[PDB]
mmCIF file of all heavy atoms in Angstrom:
data_model
loop_
_atom_site.group_PDB
_atom_site.id
_atom_site.type_symbol
_atom_site.label_atom_id
_atom_site.label_comp_id
_atom_site.label_asym_id
_atom_site.label_seq_id
_atom_site.Cartn_x
_atom_site.Cartn_y
_atom_site.Cartn_z
ATOM 1 N N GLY A 61 115.943 75.720 158.325
ATOM 2 C CA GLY A 61 115.862 76.906 159.167
ATOM 3 C C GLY A 61 114.545 76.893 159.914
ATOM 4 O O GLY A 61 113.635 76.189 159.505
ATOM 5 N N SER A 62 114.462 77.605 161.045
ATOM 6 C CA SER A 62 113.175 77.826 161.700
ATOM 7 C C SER A 62 112.346 78.792 160.825
ATOM 8 O O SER A 62 112.894 79.478 159.937
ATOM 9 C CB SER A 62 113.322 78.419 163.107
ATOM 10 O OG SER A 62 114.125 77.654 163.985
ATOM 11 N N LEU A 63 111.038 78.807 161.078
ATOM 12 C CA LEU A 63 110.052 79.557 160.316
ATOM 13 C C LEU A 63 109.154 80.314 161.278
ATOM 14 O O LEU A 63 108.804 79.809 162.352
ATOM 15 C CB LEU A 63 109.194 78.581 159.480
ATOM 16 C CG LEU A 63 107.899 78.981 158.757
ATOM 17 C CD1 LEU A 63 107.615 78.078 157.538
ATOM 18 C CD2 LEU A 63 106.676 79.039 159.689
ATOM 19 N N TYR A 64 108.773 81.529 160.885
ATOM 20 C CA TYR A 64 107.699 82.254 161.566
ATOM 21 C C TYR A 64 106.996 83.040 160.504
ATOM 22 O O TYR A 64 107.682 83.650 159.689
ATOM 23 C CB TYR A 64 108.254 83.227 162.593
ATOM 24 C CG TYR A 64 107.193 84.166 163.131
ATOM 25 C CD1 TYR A 64 106.508 83.872 164.289
ATOM 26 C CD2 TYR A 64 106.883 85.360 162.458
ATOM 27 C CE1 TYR A 64 105.558 84.733 164.784
ATOM 28 C CE2 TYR A 64 105.940 86.206 162.931
ATOM 29 C CZ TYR A 64 105.276 85.882 164.097
ATOM 30 O OH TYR A 64 104.323 86.732 164.548
ATOM 31 N N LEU A 65 105.657 83.040 160.523
ATOM 32 C CA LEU A 65 104.839 83.827 159.571
ATOM 33 C C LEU A 65 103.629 84.449 160.232
ATOM 34 O O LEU A 65 102.782 83.732 160.768
ATOM 35 C CB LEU A 65 104.296 82.914 158.477
ATOM 36 C CG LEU A 65 105.188 82.130 157.563
ATOM 37 C CD1 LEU A 65 104.295 81.237 156.761
ATOM 38 C CD2 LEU A 65 105.982 83.087 156.643
ATOM 39 N N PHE A 66 103.526 85.770 160.196
ATOM 40 C CA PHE A 66 102.282 86.448 160.606
ATOM 41 C C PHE A 66 101.548 86.707 159.323
ATOM 42 O O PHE A 66 102.031 87.478 158.487
ATOM 43 C CB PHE A 66 102.565 87.769 161.358
ATOM 44 C CG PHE A 66 101.328 88.451 161.882
ATOM 45 C CD1 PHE A 66 100.863 88.219 163.177
ATOM 46 C CD2 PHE A 66 100.638 89.377 161.075
ATOM 47 C CE1 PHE A 66 99.713 88.854 163.639
ATOM 48 C CE2 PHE A 66 99.480 90.009 161.534
ATOM 49 C CZ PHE A 66 99.023 89.757 162.814
ATOM 50 N N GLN A 67 100.416 86.014 159.142
ATOM 51 C CA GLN A 67 99.776 85.915 157.813
ATOM 52 C C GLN A 67 98.433 86.624 157.764
ATOM 53 O O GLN A 67 97.593 86.363 158.622
ATOM 54 C CB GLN A 67 99.522 84.433 157.461
ATOM 55 C CG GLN A 67 100.765 83.559 157.202
ATOM 56 C CD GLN A 67 100.424 82.305 156.393
ATOM 57 O OE1 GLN A 67 100.818 82.183 155.238
ATOM 58 N NE2 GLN A 67 99.632 81.418 156.965
ATOM 59 N N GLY A 68 98.235 87.491 156.757
ATOM 60 C CA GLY A 68 96.891 87.960 156.392
ATOM 61 C C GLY A 68 96.081 86.894 155.666
ATOM 62 O O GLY A 68 96.609 86.189 154.802
ATOM 63 N N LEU A 69 94.804 86.785 156.016
ATOM 64 C CA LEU A 69 93.899 85.750 155.494
ATOM 65 C C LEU A 69 92.695 86.290 154.747
ATOM 66 O O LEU A 69 91.883 85.511 154.212
ATOM 67 C CB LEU A 69 93.355 84.869 156.630
ATOM 68 C CG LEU A 69 94.338 84.179 157.579
ATOM 69 C CD1 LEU A 69 93.607 83.273 158.567
ATOM 70 C CD2 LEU A 69 95.304 83.388 156.769
ATOM 71 N N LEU A 70 92.579 87.608 154.696
ATOM 72 C CA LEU A 70 91.405 88.209 154.113
ATOM 73 C C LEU A 70 91.492 87.990 152.623
ATOM 74 O O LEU A 70 92.582 87.941 152.058
ATOM 75 C CB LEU A 70 91.287 89.698 154.456
ATOM 76 C CG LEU A 70 91.157 89.970 155.957
ATOM 77 C CD1 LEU A 70 91.871 91.264 156.355
ATOM 78 C CD2 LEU A 70 89.705 89.971 156.391
ATOM 79 N N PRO A 71 90.348 87.785 151.985
ATOM 80 C CA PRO A 71 90.413 87.691 150.532
ATOM 81 C C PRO A 71 90.902 89.018 149.877
ATOM 82 O O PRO A 71 91.440 89.007 148.739
ATOM 83 C CB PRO A 71 88.960 87.361 150.150
ATOM 84 C CG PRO A 71 88.340 86.800 151.421
ATOM 85 C CD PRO A 71 88.979 87.628 152.492
ATOM 86 N N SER A 72 90.742 90.146 150.585
ATOM 87 C CA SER A 72 91.236 91.452 150.091
ATOM 88 C C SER A 72 91.403 92.443 151.228
ATOM 89 O O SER A 72 90.734 92.332 152.271
ATOM 90 C CB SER A 72 90.278 92.046 149.035
ATOM 91 O OG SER A 72 89.029 92.457 149.616
ATOM 92 N N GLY A 73 92.296 93.411 151.037
ATOM 93 C CA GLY A 73 92.487 94.453 152.034
ATOM 94 C C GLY A 73 93.242 94.016 153.277
ATOM 95 O O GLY A 73 92.956 94.472 154.397
#
Side-chain angles (χ1 to χ4, degrees):
Chain A
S62 303
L63 168 154
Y64 170 94
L65 300 173
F66 184 93
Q67 292 201 111
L69 306 184
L70 298 145
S72 69

